[PDB]
Write a protein that binds this ligand. Structure first.
Ligand SMILES: [Fe+3]
Ligand SMILES: [Fe+3]
Ligand SMILES: [Fe+3]
Ligand SMILES: [Fe+3]
Lengths: 338, 338
């Protein structure tokens, strides 16, 4: 009963130590440009806002009506909603990821650096996503919570190597990509839930989507200023991640039964138009456009090669009855098209 | 609306860098002595095991009977159960804590070192504690989930400085203490729930308690071998933590209303005999006895002073109608004795 493993050797500290100083000296900047784009707790939504109220006489009918709606949502949609939720639930791994980065990590757990304050407030926001989807899926009665819970324990145990090699350059680029990806994934589950006949579930997914957009804004902004100060180092970091290919956080997914769980869940998301191969390149092309890689002047020979590699990759990727039915343990081994 | 803050200046890397090698060289050892005391996922309990089954025709009556039982559990007990749950839910902070430690941290997020494998599998086990207590409290209808969710977001945002200063010595001692403390806290909520007329809730708390015991075993075992190889360095680390005083993980607790939330929740736990000042010293005295500090030979002058300080502290601490009623937002501002 062995979960899938990372296939490559692991590399640490790709960035030079006499280069941590840039982020140390960028602390004030991040206060004024990253930490001012944070919502105070008091003004934040909470999972209870979108769930049946257990301290209300209305609780029983609210639960009953949620379950009635859930019957009319097909299995393959629940498969994707479940994969999205499991990913959200591996959150502890992702805060660990952000705290492996050399010049921008929380060194105590309560560090008063602008980088540490951001990391903690971002985590705290992400925690509500899992909580809300978890209790929604629980109440629904449509899915196998034990096998989901088992998948999650495997996932946190396995963790994940995003190949950011302790570099804020690689790591902040990696977060920029992932934030956009979930914003899209969640955005698309919200759009579909409207017509599927269920406004309350559309609210849940879209409220999560709006959070990811704020996270995206802040991470791409950090890399924006990284290109301003260090065009040579940042363009090389960009290419590096694309050369290696962006590996998704939940790719070591395992439920104790299927050896290709992520690939199988991804294909269902692909077929339903939740997150596609086309999406992947659309993010690449948006990020190449957002950081204006084509207009970067005075680079190295090593930097100009990197520049050309990232600029030409988005059209290259885009140039790339059939699928069978397969059982999923998340839905008691009922089957969906892959 | 400002949460409480850490009152001291933060210190990093108290341990010498030419001393990371000890833990690097201890990797095989931890495999054979720490990682063999880990339960495989397949054999682990999951929160669904102790909760109403939403895919069963019995779901409605199971939920109804849980809520009927919950009416007969008094408010002050729910206050403590809620504080215990919020602490469990700040989990991401605690994995960050373990990954700030110099020679034993996960540097990628999927590192194949024995230290990183342990950290990930421990986190994965801890994640079920929050999930289970969260859904139990939700279904109960006795508590204010929005204000609890708000307290949690404040908590992760604030994080926590355990003052372990990136040292595995200080950090592993700090975990040894905390594991014992929760094992007791959860153990006592389980004992009481029996007579309170509710076996299912007693099962929940005790199953969590059994996990903490396994965690305790492993952490005290690491410090056991630390005293064997480095009596001088470890006794100094022990005292250091006690001199500073063990600060609890959820001590910056804040709900947007009470400025002394942790102190107020602690007092209710104290009055009910869940976790007391007496407990605190009983852990100290167990740990002084467990690591056999009295029998440590050939220490430094600086080491002999440390030895005497830790050995004499447990009796010293033990030598230390009245309380008012106070509202708690966790229970819709209903009041309990403090
Ligand atoms: Fe999210
Ligand atoms: Fe996000
Ligand atoms: Fe726990
Ligand atoms: Fe524990």
């Amino acid at each position: 009963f062995m979960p899938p493993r990372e296939v490559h050797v692991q590399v640490t500290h790709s960035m030079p130590p006499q280069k941590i100083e840039i982020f140390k000296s960028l602390d004030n900047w991040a206060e004024e440009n990253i930490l001012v784009h944070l919502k105070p707790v008091e003004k934040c939504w909470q999972p209870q806002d979108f769930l049946p109220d257990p301290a209300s006489d209305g609780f029983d009918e609210q639960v009953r009506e949620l379950r009635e709606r859930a019957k009319e949502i097909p299995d393959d949609y629940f498969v994707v909603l479940v994969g999205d939720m499991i990913t959200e639930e591996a959150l502890p791994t992702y805060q660990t990821m952000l705290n492996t980065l050399d010049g921008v990590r929380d060194e105590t757990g309560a560090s008063p650096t602008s980088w540490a304050i951001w990391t903690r407030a971002w985590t705290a926001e992400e925690n509500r996503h899992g909580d809300l989807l978890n209790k929604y899926l629980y109440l629904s009665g449509r899915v196998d919570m034990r096998q989901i819970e088992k998948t999650i324990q495997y996932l946190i145990g396995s963790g994940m190597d995003p190949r950011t090699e302790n570099s804020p350059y690689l790591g902040f680029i990696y977060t920029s990509f992932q934030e956009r990806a979930t914003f899209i994934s969640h955005g698309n589950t919200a759009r579909q839930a409207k017509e599927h006949g269920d406004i309350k579930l559309a609210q849940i997914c879209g409220t999560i989507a709006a959070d990811e957009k704020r996270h995206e804004t802040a991470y791409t902004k950090i890399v924006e200023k990284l290109f301003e100060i260090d065009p040579d180092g940042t363009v090389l970091a960009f290419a590096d991640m694309m050369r290696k290919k962006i590996s998704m956080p939940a790719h070591l997914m395992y439920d104790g039964r299927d050896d290709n769980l992520f690939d199988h869940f991804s294909a269902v998301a692909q077929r339903l138009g939740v997150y596609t191969a086309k999406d992947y390149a659309d993010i690449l092309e948006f990020l190449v456009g957002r950081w204006k890689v084509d207009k970067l002047t005075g680079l190295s020979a090593e930097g100009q090669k990197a520049q050309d590699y990232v600029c030409r990759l988005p059209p290259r990727i885009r140039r790339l009855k059939e699928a069978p039915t397969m059982p999923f343990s998340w839905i008691f081994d009922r089957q969906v098209k892959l």
